[PDB]
Chain A
Amino acid sequence: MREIVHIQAGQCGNQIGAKFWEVISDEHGIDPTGSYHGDSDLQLERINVYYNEATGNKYVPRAILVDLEPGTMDSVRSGPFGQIFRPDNFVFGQSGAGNNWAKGHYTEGAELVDSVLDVVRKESESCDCLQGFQLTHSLGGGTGSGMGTLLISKIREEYPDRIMNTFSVMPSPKVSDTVVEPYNATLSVHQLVENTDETYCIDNEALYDICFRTLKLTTPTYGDLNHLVSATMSGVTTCLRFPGQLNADLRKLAVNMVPFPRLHFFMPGFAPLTSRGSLTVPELTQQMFDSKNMMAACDPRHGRYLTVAAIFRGRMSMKEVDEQMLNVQNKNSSYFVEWIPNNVKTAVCDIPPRGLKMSATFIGNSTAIQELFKRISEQFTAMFRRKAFLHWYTGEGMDEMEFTEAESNMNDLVSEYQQYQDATAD
């Protein structure tokens, strides 16, 4: 298991996708022209997981950039690493989707999907041992949510044996008060439950709450939010990009983190929380498991952890980490299911991220994620009950039956989480 093919779709997908490529390039010593200027052999050891090696010793991201809106290409090109991407990997349409999921999934988006698939095919045939795909997208809009889910199902049919992983950004009226977002998000969750192996739930409600209440930034912007996103994304991909004790890969993460095929929605966390411009192992382990440090607006103490993976970065005693992790699990034993023995896995990586000597990254499969799904469901129901703006979807070919189906699948997902939260060992 080696190469990952990355795909970024829509405005959100591309904005967070670009920030990811800027942050991991810096960690691996890769400058904006594709050249390596680092000081450690550990930076190039697993570089092939995300970058292709072109002639002239140039590491080029295995990144495919997609969007129905043409103006996104210009904003990606004008960024610090805008010239590192392969010119033929930009697949952009002529007109947007207007926050309409039906346009992305059935009309404009379906007319541009065969073009993106040709590019995926080329990058996949350039892999000796392809492990899977990574997709960055929002669920609130039309392109990343509608076309993104269509792309997932298309790739799932041609590569049914490879892992499908997404970084899915959940809508919040605190960041975007656009009332059709609960429709787009619900329709997409219905697709995600069936067609992905693992999904990192990055919630704009939690990102806004952290920026406003913890960092104390009165008017947070996409930049303040995306700083938390890029730190999480660097954290959760650490074991894919650096040697470590394990030869970690997307399939071993799935097998050990997902006990039930539908419950593959992860709650990531990060410590310490910092803002742009601006610790001991016991503080790090406490902060990492704190409700204010989660990237999904869910209180972990309201549910139970089915599985957890923690990644510690920097210089610290491995015995210290073992003792402190054992201690958190013992003193907080009622927040772990007792029928999955040894459900907490820890890793330590020597290389820390930029500007921090220590860091901890949390990946939890917790039943408390139902709180996020319930929030979206309540909003979808308020809108759907009054049929507000349904013609915008039905006029594009959608059946009203699809809305009820997405609602029913989402409420069933919530019931499934409650089922394992109430389950006992005996």
Chain B
Amino acid sequence: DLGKKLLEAARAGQDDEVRILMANGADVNATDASGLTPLHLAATYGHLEIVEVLLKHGADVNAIDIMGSTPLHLAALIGHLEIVEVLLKHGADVNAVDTWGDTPLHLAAIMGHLEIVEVLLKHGADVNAQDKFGKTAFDISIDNGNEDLAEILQK
């Protein structure tokens, strides 16, 4: 089962191992027990090079795990700006919604990744999208008193 080893190599940042495993038939779209693919794992752990190789070998840029998280949700949440841009360039759905009604914008806003917030907005992020509690990204900036974030959202 090369899919299991490819999930581990993507998380560990083993570039050479990822290339070798794909060359021997490893499922690029393999999933773990919660539906995380190698692309979700590389995107969460900040391995830019692995994200780019997986995208050139049939990875679904919009794969969702059991909680509706896409690789873009996790890149936006952890704060990897360079991976957010690559995902958007490869067709990531900027407005994808997870099981909590969160979009990547809500996650970059909560965690204070203002540069990623700017990128999501320039790429079409919906400022009116509400989470399951009815809150938009702007509502989070108002409720938490984040003046810097409120200014960016009003651009």
Report if A and B touch in the complex (beta carbons < 8 A).
Answer: yes
- Chain A residues packing against B (C-beta within 8 Å): 172-174, 177, 179, 209, 213, 297, 299, 371, 374-375, 378-379, 382-383, 385-386, 388
Q: Are B110 and A382 in contact (CB under 8 A)?
A: yes
Q: In the complex, which residue of chain A has the Cβ closest to the Cβ of B65?
A: A386
Q: In the complex, which residue of chain B has the Cβ closest to the Cβ of A173?
A: B112
Given A375-B144, A378-B144, A382-B107, the answer on whether A388 and B113 have CB atoms closer than 8 Å is: no
- B111 interfacial by beta-carbon distance below 8 Å: yes
Q: Are B145 and A386 in contact (CB under 8 A)?
A: no
Given A174-B148, A385-B100, the answer on whether A179 and B110 have CB atoms closer than 8 Å is: no
Q: In the complex, which residue of chain A has the Cβ closest to the Cβ of B113?
A: A177
Q: Are B113 and A386 in contact (CB under 8 A)?
A: no
Q: Are A299 and B69 in contact (CB under 8 A)?
A: no
A213 and B74 CA atoms in complex are apart in Å by 31
Q: Are A388 and B78 in contact (CB under 8 A)?
A: yes
Q: In the complex, which residue of chain B has the Cβ closest to the Cβ of A209?
A: B147
Q: Are B79 and A385 in contact (CB under 8 A)?
A: no
Q: For residue B100, which residues in chain A have a CB less than 8 angstroms away from its CB?
A: 385
With beta carbons under 8 angstroms apart, the residue of A179, A371, A374, A385 that contacts B111 is A179
A383 and B113 CA atoms in complex are apart in Å by 13
Q: For residue B111, which residues in chain A have a CB less than 8 angstroms away from its CB?
A: 173, 177, 179, 379, 382-383
Q: In the complex, which residue of chain B has the Cβ closest to the Cβ of A176?
A: B112
Question: Which 4 pairs across A and B sit closest by C-beta, in order of nearness?
Answer: A173-B112, A382-B110, A375-B144, A179-B78
Q: For residue A179, which residues in chain B have a CB less than 8 angstroms away from its CB?
A: 77-79, 111
Q: For residue B110, which residues in chain A have a CB less than 8 angstroms away from its CB?
A: 378-379, 382
Query: How far does the Cβ of A210 sit from chain B's closest Cβ, in whole Å?
Result: 12
Q: Are A388 and B74 in contact (CB under 8 A)?
A: yes
Query: How far does the Cβ of B129 sit from chain A's closest Cβ, in whole Å?
Result: 15
Interface string of B106-124 (1 = CB under 8 A from A): 0100111100000000000
Query: How far does the Cβ of B64 sit from chain A's closest Cβ, in whole Å?
Result: 12
Q: List, sorted by A's number, 13 A–B pairs whose CB atoms are closer than 8 Å.
A: A172-B112, A173-B112, A173-B113, A177-B111, A177-B112, A374-B144, A378-B144, A382-B107, A385-B100, A386-B67, A386-B77, A388-B77, A388-B78
- B62 interfacial by beta-carbon distance below 8 Å: no
A386 and B102 CA atoms in complex are apart in Å by 12
A177 and B108 CA atoms in complex are apart in Å by 11
- B44 interfacial by beta-carbon distance below 8 Å: yes
Q: Are A297 and B145 in contact (CB under 8 A)?
A: yes
